[PDB]
Each structure stands twice: as structure tokens, then as C-alpha cells.
């Protein structure tokens, strides 16, 4: 055939891939974390948006830290050979490098490590997108006039 | 270059993209009625541009939308009139378009 370029990810596999949305609204009282009013609006918007991009969307609500880790492990061990990409959206409380399960924190590195090139072979070479709505600390941006 | 078979391996951290709602060290803002500033803006820009723009360009539009259109309102002076910028962290090795063919 003619000249070929290799500058863009192959996104014409039979499936776009999974879009896992973890929507943590209500937290165990002992954590002292507030209910995240408005997050269901986010979860519904994401579900519709990624549906229209042809992702296989799975919405999960109010997962403990243990449930988050088991979900990521399980999802990373699925057959992704027919899938172009992987998307995970995390909606929760957080701190730098951390997102909260309903009963306590999870290191983001623990979640994303399941999908490493050497640990998730059916996603090797494929884009792995993590979308994180959570605090990264307590600084406030005062802005500047333009 | 001393290893043409270098291309036989890729880094285990390659091909990840982390679309953070906010800059390192910062709070992230969520409106109780409208949803979070970032997710609101992300969905709007994907709906408008996923059949048109490469993903990093979509996320740059999200950065601009969050940066320009949102400012907090609070009765607490500490939390009032604050701004947010999201933070695109890319270890991708290729351009990403959600459409094909």
C-alpha cells in the first residue's frame, strides 16, 4: 500500500472499551467526610457523554476502599483484546495522590498500577485514561484580574 | 543509540493520561446543584468536540472553560471568589481521537 503514518492510537477495535465511573457520594460517618452533593449530576453526565462515545459504561456508587481495589483488580483482568482503550472516572474526596473510598483512602498509584503495561497485557500500547474529580490538597487559587 | 531492540519494550508507565480536575496541592470545586466545575466542563467539551479534536486539545478547552467561566461564591471570606485550573498529565505516546475511519 501507500505511505503509512503511526501518529494516532488505533481506536477502531470492535469496542471502544470500558468506562468505569466510581461515584462516591455518601461516606461512613466515622470518616468525618461530608456528603458530596451534586456528584450524581456528574455521574449521570459522564454516563451519557461516554455512552455517546460508544464506551461500555459501568456506574458504581459508594464503594469502600476495599471495593475500589477489588473492582480495579477485576476489571484489569478482563479480556480487553477487542477494546481500543480504558477509561476510569473517580468522583470523591481526595488529597494529593489519594482518593477516598467511603471508609477511607486509596492511593491513586494502587488503582492505576493494575493497568501497568506489564500487568494488564491486553491494554499494553492502548490509552488508559484516568479522570479524577477530587481535591489534591487545601490550597485555594485567588485568581488575578485580566 | 546502542540498542535498536529498545523499541521491543515500552515503559510500564507509558500510555496513561491523568485528567485531574485541579492543580497539585489545590482544592477542587463542586457545585451542589450543577455538579463539579471540571466534570461539567469536560462533558460539555467532549459533546461538542469529540468528533472534531484530538483529546489533548479537548482537555485544553476544558482548562479554558474552567479557568474563565467559574468563580466560587461563599459567605466565608476564606472560600469566596476563588478560581480553579485543571491539570492534564499525559504519558501518552500517540494522538487520541475518539472517532475513526
Amino acid at each position: 500500500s501507500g505511505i503509512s503514518l503511526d501518529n494516532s492510537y488505533k481506536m477502531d477495535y470492535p469496542e471502544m472499551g470500558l468506562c468505569i465511573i466510581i461515584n462516591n457520594k455518601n461516606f461512613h460517618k466515622s470518616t468525618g467526610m461530608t456528603s458530596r452533593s451534586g456528584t450524581d449530576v456528574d455521574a449521570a453526565n459522564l454516563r451519557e457523554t461516554f455512552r455517546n462515545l460508544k464506551y461500555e459504561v459501568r456506574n458504581k456508587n459508594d464503594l469502600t476502599r476495599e471495593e475500589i481495589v477489588e473492582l480495579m483488580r477485576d476489571v484489569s483482568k478482563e479480556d480487553h483484546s477487542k477494546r481500543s482503550s480504558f477509561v476510569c472516572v473517580l468522583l470523591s474526596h481526595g488529597e494529593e495522590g489519594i482518593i477516598f473510598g467511603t471508609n477511607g483512602p486509596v492511593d491513586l498509584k494502587k488503582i492505576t498500577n493494575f493497568f501497568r503495561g506489564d500487568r494488564c497485557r491486553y491494554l499494553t500500547g492502548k490509552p488508559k485514561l484516568f479522570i479524577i474529580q477530587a481535591c489534591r490538597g487545601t490550597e485555594l487559587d485567588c485568581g488575578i484580574e485580566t | 543509540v546502542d540498542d535498536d531492540m529498545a523499541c521491543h519494550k515500552i515503559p510500564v508507565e507509558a500510555d496513561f493520561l491523568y485528567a485531574y480536575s485541579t492543580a497539585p496541592g489545590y482544592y477542587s470545586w463542586r457545585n451542589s446543584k450543577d455538579g463539579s466545575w471540571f466534570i461539567q466542563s469536560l462533558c460539555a467539551m467532549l459533546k461538542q468536540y469529540a468528533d472534531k479534536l484530538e483529546f489533548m486539545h479537548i482537555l485544553t478547552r476544558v482548562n479554558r472553560k474552567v479557568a474563565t467561566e467559574f468563580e466560587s461564591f461563599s459567605f466565608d471570606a476564606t472560600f469566596h471568589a476563588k478560581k480553579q485550573i485543571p491539570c492534564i498529565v499525559s504519558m501518552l505516546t500517540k494522538e487520541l481521537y475518539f472517532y475513526h475511519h
Binding site: 461530608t34 481526595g94 477530587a134 | 463539579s36
Partner: peptide, 4 residues
């Protein structure tokens, strides 16, 4: 407006 609330923080996360």
C-alpha cells in the same frame, strides 16, 4: 459551591 463546595470543596472536595
Amino acid at each position: 459551591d463546595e470543596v472536595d
